[PDB]
Curated annotation (Swiss-Prot), chains A, B:
Enzyme class at the top of the EC tree: oxidoreductase
Organism: Bacillus subtilis (strain 168)
Enzyme Commission number(s) of this protein: 1.14.14.47
Family: Belongs to the NOS family. Bacterial NOS oxygenase subfamily.
Note: This protein is similar to the oxygenase domain of eukaryotic nitric oxide synthases but lacks the reductase domain which, in eukaryotes, is responsible for transfer of electrons to the ferric heme during nitric oxide synthesis.
Self-association state and partner proteins as the record states: Homodimer.
Residues annotated as binding heme: C65
UniProt entry keywords in alphabetical sequence: Heme, Iron, Metal-binding, Oxidoreductase
Cofactor note: Tetrahydrobiopterin (H4B). Can also use tetrahydrofolate (THF) in place of tetrahydrobiopterin (H4B) but binds THF with much lower affinity than H4B.
Top-level taxon: Bacteria
Protein name (record): Nitric oxide synthase oxygenase
Keyword Iron among record annotations: yes
Gene Ontology biological process terms, A to Z: nitric oxide biosynthetic process
Length: 362, 362
């Protein structure tokens, strides 16, 4: 059964991938090799080219991503050879290092061994490789509430944060065979952080806000041709709204808008004064300014929307069907000022793709 | 066939309406009367109570409306007795007058005779009873582009606008029997307009912006118990975003953001400066301030979202199933600062309701 489902998904993928690669004649003698290897071993092993392209095809089919224009420039690191947790850790250290690239962020993905027969070889617990801790205990709310569950889990394993609002969580992953995950504190030298300042409001630094340079998502399942790479951390760069309008703005996150309104000198008393809307703008201007000022990659929601329109045009030009999630594609500030708002998208799921998976903690 | 569809819809409605009215025992001797009247006449006639409540039930089931909290305070004017176009016109004049209420807007709906056997008795061409004209001719873009089609149609019938950016369109409707619609110029005394000013930027008046006080939608089909009131203009008050973020902001409408950015003293050169977002806020602050300053009803998107949450709570409290359109319920500015963004809604269509219908023009 599980041998059949793999064969069907692989037939669809290899045909399409080789179709796009210009190896349409190589499809047949490859499917045979797979047809045998599947029957004999239970699974098949991707070539370096299929996997590189499969990871690019998966980003392209991410209905919720606004930055899909550059799907083909994705730097794919093939780490299916890792066996030890010192290799996993070093590869994760290297990913941070090479994806960061001194501030000029390279969209990168590191691919670890996939599930054999549903069995994970490596199991990453981090949502993102770089992420702040969160603490909730008796009136105490410190750090990122979104990180509360993982933080408690890490503290169950011997780790202790300094309990600042910006404690770097450790890397925490579990190898096949071991009962508990291991954890490694992140070298500070490898992590770029950006202090949030404002172009013309010098009082803005009094908020002492900051965020990390590179968002490296590490808890999603890359699925390529019936093969489940449950451990494949990828990254791009930030769209400013993710930080300025959600991470630092949400009440169930950092909840900084009243503080922003105070330092930008406006009152937070009346809804009719639109202080939340005004604070959201100056904070988001601050995030973009701070990242540019340091030399770290970032895009604003308008430029990103322009780029995504090109992706729509590129897709149409290629005879490729477009898929997208409107509810996720629209930016959380001024969405009506983007073309995304004024058209619809087909939220159908095409593989290869990236999927959510259950947390090993909680 | 058309006799059956009416009977099914009526059975569902009468049962439910009387259920809510506390006349659950009166359901049976009423359905009989309908069962006969349908068989003998092809249709049935609503009582003054069912229609009043049916129009309130229809507003409640509008998945896209954020102001549904006050569905029960809807003022229903029963004008199913109109036979002449001087009665239709006067009723429309009266609707404007009583709904406006010197600035303290009453949510009102005027109900005209419904379709007999698919045949319209009255056919209103106006999108809204009060709306500005739009002109596009050889580089000329004057007024509201959204009104271009209707405006041209009105000018085909002897009407001529002064070709300002804010020409009041005439009322234009067609009576059963007549080939062409008639038109009547609106008495200026009945129309409240609001000049857009800014609380602290005196240069804002240089834009010479204004909008009308009351949005009275007149091209939607009210459906109550298999009965199609194709002519039932209704109104509430404006949520500020409709004017400040869409009507006056969209490029395919009034397209005023660069002009707003100029008068509020910021540059419109870089996306990273978030000038569209900043202009959208000050313009929207201007709209709310201008309406309050004059004494015309208006609500901001935050207060409206708070009210809609109460509607959600009121519905849950009543054992009533909630339906809603997330893509339309979220406001076009700072939507993530509202609870609407962070939950989902069932976009199922429940009757009674309001529906789009084909334009007699274009
Ligand atoms: C190049 C820079 C990129 C930008 C600016 C970008 C932008 C975004 C944004 C803003 C989101 C919404 C996230 C949220 O609201 O929480 C998103 C979602 C997503 N992006 Fe991208 N993205 C980029 C690169 C990538 C890359 C390299 C991949 C993977 C190969 C990817 C795959 C996805 C996926 C899977 C989601 C959905 C995540 C979810 O379900 O929460 N994107 N993208
Ligand atoms: C009390 C004040 C009201 C407010 C503030 C309000 C707010 C809104 C808003 C903002 C929209 C979205 C319109 C758009 O984006 O174009 C909307 C849609 C709608 N509202 Fe309301 N509304 C109110 C009263 C009413 C009333 C009295 C009715 C009818 C009885 C109604 C029925 C609807 C319907 C049918 C739509 C959907 C129209 C469409 O499909 O374009 N609302 N409402
Ligand atoms: N710039 C980018 C690129 C890719 C991204 C991929 C994923 C995400 C976030 N997805 C998970 C959101 C769910 C969540 C998790 C924790 C706290 N709140 C919400 C962002 C990306 N950004
Ligand atoms: N405050 C309110 C209350 C009720 C409303 C009902 C309808 C509308 C607008 N619906 C039609 C939008 C489609 C359109 C038409 C012309 C130009 N652009 C878009 C607003 C309401 N507002
Ligand atoms: C209910 C809704 O799907 C949910 O709140 C979504 C809305 N759209 C979103 N869009 C983005 N980019 N990110 C999000 O977290 C969400 N949340
Ligand atoms: C494609 C999408 O449905 C369309 O652009 C909608 C989005 N949500 C909206 N929401 C409101 N309130 N008004 C609108 O006109 C629209 N337009
Ligand atoms: Cl993030
Ligand atoms: Cl309107």
């Amino acid at each position: 059964e599980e041998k059949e489902i793999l064969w069907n998904e692989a037939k669809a993928f290899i045909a399409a991938c080789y179709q796009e690669l210009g190896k349409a004649a190589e499809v047949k003698d490859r499917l045979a090799d797979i047809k045998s290897e599947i029957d004999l071993t239970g699974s098949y092993v991707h070539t370096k080219e299929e996997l590189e392209h499969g990871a690019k095809m998966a980003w392209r089919n991410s209905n919720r991503c606004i930055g899909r224009l550059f799907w083909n420039s994705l730097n794919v690191i093939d780490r299916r050879d890792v066996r030890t947790k010192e290799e996993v850790r070093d590869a994760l250290f290297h990913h941070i290092e090479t994806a960061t690239n001194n501030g000029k962020i390279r969209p990168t993905i590191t691919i670890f061994p996939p599930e054999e027969k549903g069995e994970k070889q490596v199991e990453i617990w981090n949502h993102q490789l770089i992420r702040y801790a969160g603490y909730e205990s008796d009136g105490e709310r410190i750090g990122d509430p979104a990180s509360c569950s993982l933080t408690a889990a890490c503290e169950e394993l011997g780790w202790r944060g300094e309990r600042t609002d910006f404690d770097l969580l450790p890397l925490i992953f579990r190898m096949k065979g071991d009962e508990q995950p291991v954890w490694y504190e992140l070298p500070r030298s490898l992590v770029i952080e950006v202090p949030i300042t404002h172009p013309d409001i010098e009082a803005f630094s009094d908020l002492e806000l900051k965020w990390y340079g590179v968002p490296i998502i590490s808890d999603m399942k890359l699925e390529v041709g019936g093969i489940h790479y449950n451990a494949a951390p990828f990254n791009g760069w930030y769209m400013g709204t993710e930080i300025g309008a959600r991470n630092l703005a949400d009440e169930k996150r950092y909840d900084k808008l009243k503080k922003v309104a105070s330092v930008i000198g406006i009152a937070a008393d009346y809804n009719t004064d639109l202080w939340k809307d005004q604070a959201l703008v100056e904070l988001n201007k601050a995030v973009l300014h701070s990242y540019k000022k340091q030399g770290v990659s970032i895009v604003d929601h308008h430029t990103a929307a322009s780029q995504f329109k090109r992706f729509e045009e590129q897709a149409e030009e290629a005879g490729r069907k477009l898929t997208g999630d409107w509810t996720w594609l629209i930016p959380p500030i001024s969405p009506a000022a983007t073309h995304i708002f004024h058209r619809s998208y087909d939220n159908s799921i095409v593989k290869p793709n990236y999927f959510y998976q259950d947390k090993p903690y909680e």
